[PDB]
């Protein structure tokens, strides 16, 4: 109302595409797909992990953060031994939480959820 404004670290999608442009496609999606969530997934700067082929994702609102984590690992083509960690607003999100709950708490003003991944906790 009285609702917190979420500011995150520097994402590349947040360098390529002015806020007025990022915003626009944001409200366009949530009206076209109310049951799903727009998520931007990028590699952390110093992280030693393979870069993601595609970084724009439409995720079901009732899918857990943990399930999306295993989904990304399969896309990064990590093996069963590799370490990977999500950072949403520079904090590691709970696995039990749903992507809908995570979006509602950590979406920026452009109606985009930003998830960063690394092999360490920075």
Author numbering: 0 to 121
Task: Show sentences the authors wrote.
To provide a molecular basis for the specificity of the PLEKHM1‐LIR interaction with the mATG8 proteins, we solved the crystal structures of PLEKHM1‐LIR in complex with the LC3A, LC3C, GABARAP and GABARAP‐L1 proteins.
To obtain the complex structures, we created chimeric proteins consisting of the mATG8 C‐terminally fused to the LIR sequence with a Gly/Ser linker. V51 GABARAPs’ side chains are in close proximity to the PLEKHM1 V638 (3.8 and 4.3 Å for GABARAP and GABARAP‐L1, respectively), while side chains of residues in equivalent positions of LC3 subfamily proteins are further away (LC3A/B/C V54/V54/V60 – 4.2/4.6/4.6 Å). In the GABARAPs complex structures, the corresponding R67 side chains are flexible and the salt bridges are absent. This is likely due the increased flexibility of the GABARAPs D45 residues, which are not visible in the electron density maps.
